[PDB]
Design a binder for these strands. Structure first.
Lengths: 80, 70, 121, 85, 194
RNA sequence: UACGAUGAAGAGUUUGAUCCUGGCUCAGGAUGAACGCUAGCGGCAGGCUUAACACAUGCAAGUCGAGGGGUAGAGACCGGCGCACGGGUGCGUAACGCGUAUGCAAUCUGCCUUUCACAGAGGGAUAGCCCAGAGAAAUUUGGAUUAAUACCUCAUAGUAUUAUAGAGCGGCAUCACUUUAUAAUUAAAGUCACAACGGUGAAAGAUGAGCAUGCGUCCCAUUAGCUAGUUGGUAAGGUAACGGCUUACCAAGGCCACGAUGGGUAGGGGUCCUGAGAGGGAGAUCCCCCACACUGGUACUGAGACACGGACCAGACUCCUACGGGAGGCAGCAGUGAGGAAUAUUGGUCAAUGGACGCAAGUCUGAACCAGCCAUGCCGCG
RNA sequence: GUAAGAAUAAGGAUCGGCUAACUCCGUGCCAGCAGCCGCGGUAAUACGGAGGAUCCAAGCGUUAUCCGGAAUCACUGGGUUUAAAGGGUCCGUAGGCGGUUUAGUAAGUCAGUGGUGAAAGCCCAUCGCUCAACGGUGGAACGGCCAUUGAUACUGCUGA
């Protein structure tokens, strides 16, 4: 295989059918002042039985595009 | 215009008339077929041979046909 | 000041407004004159400087200063403005090339011949 | 069809060619795949720097040499070595 | 281009005979001009000092400002003493070596003999005066113009010159402590870094 | 008393005179440069930055008789390949367009290379030509018609496709690779003899082409709400391929101060100039990617195009006309008019390299190699 | 390669200070010059001409657009009593920063390996054009990104 990309994030909202949206925070150094800045990005993952709720810590992996703006799936729910 | 330019507008017409004939002949069949199922698969495969219908798409149609006739 | 303040809003760099603006950022511009007259400096100089109202090819009305002595510069003449203001006439911010299409050069000039458009005797 | 051809890279008057494998639908001295050798017809021996470790590899992968390419790869080897099955 | 003018004037405007200590160096040694013969300006600026110290070397060899700046920034690529390598590459010129070998008693004659296919360098004839002689070159004289009238008429620590075959075997690149010249390279470096 | 680092200059000006803060200017480098004066060459490089304004004329993509009927004494036609390459421009685009790193278990792939199984019988047509026209031309209408490596039927062929049924291996969820039966369905071409060149199907490789994703992607917050197929799901239609790509139904979701939306500007990068460095300013010439071809839309042929020198339609210009109707697109090379301060020969050759066709000989190539003009820049000499 | 013949070939800018170079003649706040200070009202080193001098050189000056000087948007590398600059004062949201010890992970940080960072271009070294420009070869660089293996001193997270 090839071990497609994987991210770890926090569930932000569950208001859709069989789909969740999580937010991932990363600390990147500023290109000029060299100060580490917390930048956020929101992914859209795929859920089957609607198990995770807002405030959890999930781990998603990149797959084929299952829909528009939806190319991830939750596999490794860690904390609730 | 060129000499080679005044040959494609003449040969592509003879190709297009036959392509349209063979395309509509099987389009009408796949339309008013939805057992004589083993009669349009031949036409679909002949189109795939003539490179009209792209054997990939031809196999898509062949799979979609004999899945509801059951 | 603070690194956080700089990260939020960095240092603002100004644009350094140009000097010669009404010539479309070209070295020389052709133009037609409409009024050739004479003006006074501010102070304490005392002279009669020769200026001309030139309408450039891009639709700009400027005031050019005629260098040297000896010229025709009638009410309608094709001149070539190059730029370079003077600190005596308020408003004149351009110069006319001597030796251009229609403007005359100078006679009896021997030292600064590259300027004022004078041939070598 | 990937072909083994020559790319001119010298100066005006004195050419200097790179023996390189590239697609036929690309410009002469532009994009290529992998530089193979080097040809300098400025001395009497007509110097060459062929690489038989990749020449035969490209020939097996499906390269198609030209006249000058197959004449340079003739008296430098890899052709009597590509023939050996 | 070349200077092609009076050399006594150039010697007087610098106060140092660089074209041969001979006639006219004395006898009104003061700089030329109607205002140079009189009491010159006392206060001399450091910029004037550096500029004249550069022009002394720029006039002694016959180099233009363009080529001098090119040679300076070429020698400045060496991690060693910039002025030292500058003077070394300026001395390594072909016409300068021909002048030091005894032939062409002046550099103005060196850059008129070397530019006439009268001298050969390592076999093939080289008629370029700005030719940079690397350490270990063999300079000879063309056999056609070998028995000339001026060559035998006109005929160092690193040049091994042999008069029997017009040899000279340029080797052992000299140093500042060996090249005799009344010029300060640090001032030239400061002027070019100004 | 070592190591690496070859690198950092200021001045004038406010006051009767001083110090400090502070603004302006100059000393340096560089350019697709222009103007003035001046002017001898050689090598190399560069040359419409403005009107993507309008174009007179010449050339720029053809080739195969070893596919076919073969005519005059070659041409033209059917057929195969190419024309989607090369060449030009930067209009548009603030965006998975570009740079960077991957994935395709959601992909296709002519020509090329290596293997396996084969190239068996048949038929009706129609080009070209002939007989008559309708038209100023462009161009087009009737009749009978002769060939093909043109086209079309049946049998034949799988590590080919589909469906049902058993399996093994293996995951990264959807599932992936291989094997076994059964049923259905899909090929061929020969150049009178040899040589030589070919054709069909399956597998692998190479090359080329797509889709998705993480990060970096100008200014204005005197732009704070935006989106209604929009957000997610369930089934179909589909595309090479997953997918609101489209349709039918259910829910109200999705983005937004870490800058949505709106406006202005702009092709992006390797790079160029400058600077001690950190940075700053541009994206000519060389190379890679993207967009466009008078202004817009649409589809066919083809492996590959929604096609610069192909087609259809509409619009604005220019031309022919017998007034009924027609032909056009130099952002290709060389050139003309206009605009501008400003940028060149209506040149030579396929002799080298590359490209297309051909077994080859060979044909074409304003690609390319040379030559002319311009001190435009670098270097060298007098 | 051979034969007459120095014959066939040097100009532009500047000269009050910044900045390298000074004397005279003519005009008398006129004509004019000028990047800034600013010169000319009748003894002008600043205007025009002549002589001399300086720089560059087949080029020399002006203009237009950039970087440096400008520490003049300052992370490197500035300030806020009187020169421009502390909000009228508190509370507080988002955000920014975090007293001591200890256990765990290794996200930031550091080190190694593999892949990539096209070619061309800059720099270094070396060869061919008589040198150079130019061209060939090699290295360095491409400060970056992905996967993997280690260290746990400092920051982040969890527990005490």
């Amino acid at each position: 295989r090839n071990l497609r990309k994987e991210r770890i994030g926090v569930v932000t909202s569950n208001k859709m059918d069989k789909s969740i949206v999580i937010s991932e925070v990363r600390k990147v150094k500023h290109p000029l002042y060299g100060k580490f800045v917390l930048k956020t990005k929101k992914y859209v993952a795929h859920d089957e039985t609607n198990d995770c709720n807002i405030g959890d810590t999930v781990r998603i992996s990149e797959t084929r595009p299952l829909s528009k703006t939806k190319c991830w799936r939750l596999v490794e729910i860690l904390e609730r | 215009n060129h000499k080679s330019a005044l040959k494609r507008i003449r040969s592509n017409e003879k190709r297009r008339v036959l392509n349209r004939y063979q395309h509509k002949t099987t389009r009408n069949a796949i339309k008013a077929l939805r057992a004589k199922l083993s009669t349009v698969i031949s036409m679909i495969d002949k189109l795939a041979k003539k490179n009209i219908i792209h054997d990939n798409k031809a196999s898509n149609l062949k799979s979609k046909l004999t899945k509801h006739v059951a | 000041p603070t690194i956080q303040q700089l990260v939020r809003t960095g240092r603002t760099q100004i644009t350094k407004k140009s000097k010669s603006v009404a010539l479309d950022s070209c070295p020389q511009r052709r133009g037609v004159c409409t009024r050739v007259y004479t003006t006074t400096p501010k102070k304490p100089n005392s002279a009669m400087r020769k200026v001309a109202r030139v309408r450039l090819t891009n639709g700009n009305e400027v005031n050019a200063y005629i260098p040297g002595e000896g010229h025709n510069l009638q009410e309608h003449s094709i001149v070539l403005v190059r730029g370079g203001r003077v600190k005596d006439l308020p408003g004149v911010r351009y110069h006319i090339v001597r030796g251009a299409l229609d403007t005359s050069g100078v006679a009896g000039r021997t030292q600064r011949r590259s300027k004022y458009g004078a041939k070598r005797p | 069809s990937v072909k083994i051809r020559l790319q001119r890279h010298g100066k005006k008057g004195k050419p200097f060619y790179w023996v390189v494998a590239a697609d036929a639908r690309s410009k002469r001295d532009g994009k290529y795949l992998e530089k193979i050798g080097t040809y300098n017809p400025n001395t009497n021996p007509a110097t060459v720097e062929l690489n038989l470790d990749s020449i035969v590899k490209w020939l097996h992968q499906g390269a198609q040499p030209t006249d000058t390419a197959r004449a340079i790869l003739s008296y430098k080897g890899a052709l009597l070595k590509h023939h050996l099955d | 281009a070349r200077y092609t003018g009076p050399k006594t004037k150039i010697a007087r405007k610098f106060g140092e005979a660089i074209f041969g200590d001979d006639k006219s160096f004395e006898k009104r040694n003061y700089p030329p001009g109607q205002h140079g013969m009189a009491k010159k300006r006392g206060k001399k600026s450091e910029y004037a000092v550096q500029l004249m110290e550069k022009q002394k070397a720029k006039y002694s060899y016959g180099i233009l400002e363009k080529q001098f700046r090119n040679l300076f920034e070429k020698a400045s690529a060496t991690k060693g003493v910039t002025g030292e390598v500058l003077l070394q590459l300026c001395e390594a010129r072909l016409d300068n070596v021909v002048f030091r070998m005894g032939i062409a008693p002046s550099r103005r004659g060196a850059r008129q003999i070397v530019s006439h296919r009268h001298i050969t360098v390592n076999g093939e004839v080289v008629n370029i005066p700005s030719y940079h002689l690397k350490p270990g070159d063999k300079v000879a004289v063309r056999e056609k113009s070998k028995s000339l009238e001026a060559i035998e008429r006109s005929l160092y620590e690193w040049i091994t010159w042999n008069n029997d075959l017009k040899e000279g075997t340029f080797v052992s690149v000299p140093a500042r402590l060996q090249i005799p010249e009344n010029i300060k390279e640090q001032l030239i470096v400061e002027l070019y870094n100004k």
